[PDB]
């Protein structure tokens, strides 16, 4: 059994955190970094389960925030302290912390702790029992109003509650604190804790070759293929930090004593020449590099060329508060990674709440925060011109933002259920000359795919769904590719018209007077994979590659050229006599030409 | 306007925060460079990752004066307000701030007039970054004309020789093929006096740069 769970003390600046930690552990100046420690607990009950909680005393100061979401995991119990002295207000001021916990670790318990009971306003218990209970928040499981700097019965009850809520974690009935692990894992854990002592204090990093010599010297029976999974599990437990991804050169350096790493990386915010290149690489991996934080917080006045409503496209994004470290990740993600064409460098005006790339007066893009009156929520207005190149940029940006949300903050997409994240679209049935752009939720418009238009109560006016959401209707790609359903002759139901056995769901149909092969990509999924395959196949145009003819939305389908003689696999199995020397060479030559053009486009046709 | 203290107090009123003449009210408010309010514009340059770097493809032109004049930048900004189009139609992208404008048409047709401080120099500067293309040279000409007009029309004391003239116009050039750096600076009057030829050359005569790509307002380009 593995007795090790991560404790995390989130909180707001000026509160009691490091002193509260120093009083729970009885181990009798601001915080820089996260100050990783670990204190063991000897359970006094009959089941004396000696466990070790490794604490992560998150620093409250705002400038560090953009690094905080990186060390918030699911398998963790979060404290959150809120300085009862400034009562009835700090409880509301610690709402962003709760929302970010819920954005990062959705199903992790949280224990509110009220420091500074010494002075003064205990009616903050009222608001924390009514407001902070279940309003899209990470399931607060207890309250505690405790003093600090002085051991007391309140501190005792608090500490006992931490341990009790620790054991009763049970995500989907798992009992994380007492799960089973292979002996090799805990063995590797012990040898790492011993190697903590024998390493330069100034540079506690260790080498993969040194690790290999370590596991060879001892009785560890771990194989070379068994290393990555092992060290990864150790990483999750907060013993040593590592990044096995090959995008960085850090797959050979294994960070031991992570508190040193995090303090050193947070050092440069308030102000070993061999690894300076890797230093900057991981600095970018921490979203520090140009420094995205400390960027003057002030929108510069931007007199955009185009006004009106007809020639532009808006798309709001409503979330209660911005996530913990959202904007740095987004900016660093959109960093030249969204060109209008498939070459040219665009004009950019970075600031902490916006980017505003700019190619041409009709080919710009602007992703920037905006507040609306009588609305305590947050918004992510995306202004884009109505031209074709505009729609291309809009598609790429929505994909990148949705990618960040599904990959970083999952808690803002799962239905409870207001979803805590509502995507709008702005349209003006008043011909654009008038104003007060009506807003329509995105899911509703997605449900209005039955037609290709939207219409108000008064049916005289009508606006296409392409000029409000060119990512739903397939117009964001170049070379408009709708299939003109009048000329299609497809029958989806019968197995009589299958392309062949074991070709996915590719059917055989006639289109524009020619027999074609159509794949029914329709499923519970969204247009994500359809559009992904579409942008890949949008610009290849080579003879040795299957050429695209059209795509569709009702239902989702891909219409491509039909290979009359079937796949090469059948000819190898059925008719070996048809293949001659010249025919075999020509087949080999054509496949080689295809692979050559693909690698010329820097695309890896993984399996063949 | 009689009893001018009332006029001036009323006009300065709206800075710290008769419906018939409201149109004339706004007109004279613009005549006082109040109107959008040019003052109170956050004083903070926004980071601008310009497309073109290097030295060959751009044109700089410093303007060195000890301190910025009393009310210079508001007058300048309000003067360059859409009054310098590259062509003879299209609205350009603009990013106003208390110390710069940075119009923008295209990746090769932009312009940026903005204050810049140099280390070990208590003076002030008015760096003008402009692309080397034709439309660039057009914008540079128009901007230099408008600035010299403002100086000759508003602040005459910065042009009359005593005599360091208290206003020295530089030009930035790089005989090191642009790949290298530390753009050498040449006073404008000297280059104007170097109209005898159509080229400039350093001590080492192997390298030579045209006077058209450093000052396309002197040479008629
Ligand atoms: N009197 C009193 N002081 C407290 C209490 N809790 C914290 N403090 C003070 O708060 C300081 C600790 O702040 P700290 O948690 O380190 O701030 P942080 O590092 O930004 O999280 C100490 O100097 C304590 O004197 C309390 O309950 N009573």
Residue numbers in the entry:
A (entry chain A): 1331 to 1358, 1366 to 1457, 1463 to 1613, 1642 to 1659, 1668 to 1720, 1726 to 1799, 1804 to 1995
B (entry chain B): 1597 to 1613, 1642 to 1659, 1668 to 1720, 1726 to 1799, 1804 to 1862
Mind quoting what the paper says about this structure?
Following a similar purification approach, type II inhibitors were mixed with full-length LRRK2 protein in an ATP-free buffer before cryo-EM analysis. Both LRRK2 monomer and dimer exist in the same grid, and we were able to resolve LRRK2–ponatinib, LRRK2–GZD-824, LRRK2–rebastinib complexes at nominal overall resolutions of 3.4, 3.6, and 3.7 Å, respectively. GZD-824 and ponatinib are analogous compounds and bind to LRRK2 in a similar manner. Specifically, the main chains of A1950 and D2017 and the side chain of E1920 form polar interactions with nitrogen and oxygen atoms in all three small molecules. Our structures show that Ala2016 directly interacts with all three type II inhibitors tested here, with its side chain pointing towards the inhibitors, but not ATP. The binding of type II inhibitors resulted in the structural re-arrangement of the ATP-binding site. Furthermore, rebastinib, ponatinib, and GZD-824 occupy the position that was otherwise taken by the alpha helix of the activation segment. Tyr2018 in the “DYG” motif rotates and interacts with type II inhibitors, and Lys1906 and Glu1920 form a salt bridge. Additionally, the αC helix moves towards the ATP-binding site and interacts with the small molecules. The LRRK2–GZD824, LRRK2–rebastinib, and LRRK2–ponatinib complexes provide structural templates for designing LRRK2-specific type II inhibitors.
Leucine-rich repeat kinase 2 (LRRK2) is a highly pursued drug target for Parkinson’s disease (PD), which is the second most common neurodegenerative disease projected to affect 17.5 million people by 20401. LRRK2 is a 286-kDa protein containing seven domains (ARM, ANK, LRR, ROC, COR, KIN, and WD40) with kinase and GTPase activities. Autosomal dominant LRRK2 mutations with higher kinase activity are leading genetic causes of both familial and sporadic late-onset PD cases. Here we report high-resolution cryo-EM structures of LRRK2 in complex with a panel of small molecules, including two type I (LRRK2-IN-1 and GNE-7915) and three type II inhibitors (rebastinib, ponatinib, and GZD-824).
